[PDB]
Amino acid sequence: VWVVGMGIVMSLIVLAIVFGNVLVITAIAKFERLQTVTNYFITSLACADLVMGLAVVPFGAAHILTKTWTFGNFWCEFWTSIDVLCVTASIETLCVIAVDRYFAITSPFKYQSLLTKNKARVIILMVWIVSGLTSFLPIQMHWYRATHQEAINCYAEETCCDFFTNQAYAIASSIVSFYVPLVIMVFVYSRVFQEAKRQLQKIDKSEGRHKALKTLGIIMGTFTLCWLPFFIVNIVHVIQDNLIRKEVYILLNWIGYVNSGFNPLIYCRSPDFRIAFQELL
Ligand SMILES: CN[C@@H]1CCc2c(ccc(O)c2O)[C@H]1O
């Protein structure tokens, strides 16, 4: 008396993610004046989120509900590679957007010279290629597999595939994918908030006779609350295997996926985006 329910939730999540990604992508594509250096970074993130919602979630849902994987093992390896690719690409695109905002605010006169139409494509391609090399190379080449009897049983067993990794690979992947972007974003947003506070203190001297805090808080808190616990459990569970089981791991992992759906809503809030959406519907 619970199988008929959770499928509804999974379908709702899939539909929400797909619709949110497609609307933003088509709004940027089909309108004349929405092209901007900043919007391309949003386009890359939307493309990554669309791939995640289209490929990763539906098969994982079938695996969880059925409890049996009715395909091959090479397909499981490919699915894992695609999952890692999409996650790391999304995180790195977020950090790139943050750095672009820092460059725009800190140095207004020289903002044009640093970033142009030509130099955004190279950055996007580098982000995507470093995301791809992090996932496909260690996975598709059989170079992450564990050496325990329980893990080798899973690898040899064709029906069921579960994620087991050596501690070194887990630490390196987590460090490359999560910690450095978090540090960068923290530093960027601290500096930006300081600059905003300085300007708000400067205006009151002449204009005699909060909002930025709320905006920065929401922007940072969404990402932190969505993705932080998973990358803590990932590091901790490998050093000592007694503490954590598979169910908690899966629950913490599935929380991160929902973040991809929320992100177009938080980033696409400009009045121009609102007018573009209004023109469609
Ligand atoms: C199947 N779930 C995977 C398992 C481990 C992992 C994920 C995402 C990014 C990484 O860098 C990882 O090492 C998760 O999405």
Swiss-Prot record:
It is a multi-pass membrane protein. Keywords: Cell membrane, Disulfide bond, Endosome, G-protein coupled receptor, Glycoprotein, Golgi apparatus, Hydroxylation, Lipoprotein, Membrane, Palmitate, Phosphoprotein, Receptor, Transducer, Transmembrane, Transmembrane helix, Ubl conjugation. It comes from the Eukaryota. Residues 66-76, 145-166, 240-246 are extracellular. The keyword rRNA processing does not apply. GO terms for biological process: adenylate cyclase-activating adrenergic receptor signaling pathway; adenylate cyclase-modulating G protein-coupled receptor signaling pathway; adrenergic receptor signaling pathway; AMPA selective glutamate receptor signaling pathway; bone resorption; brown fat cell differentiation; cell surface receptor signaling pathway; cellular response to amyloid-beta. Disulfide bonds join C76-C161, C154-C160. The chain crosses the membrane at residues 5-28, 42-65, 77-99, 121-144, 167-190, 216-239, 247-270. It is found in: Cell membrane; Early endosome; Golgi apparatus. One of its GO terms (molecular function) is potassium channel regulator activity. Changing D49N: Affects binding of catecholamines, and produces an uncoupling between the receptor and stimulatory G proteins. (S)-timolol binds at D83, T88, N234, N253, Y257. Beta-adrenergic receptors mediate the catecholamine-induced activation of adenylate cyclase through the action of G proteins. The beta-2-adrenergic receptor binds epinephrine with an approximately 30-fold greater affinity than it does norepinephrine. This is Beta-2 adrenergic receptor. It comes from Homo sapiens. The lineage of its organism: Eukaryota, Metazoa, Chordata, Craniata, Vertebrata.
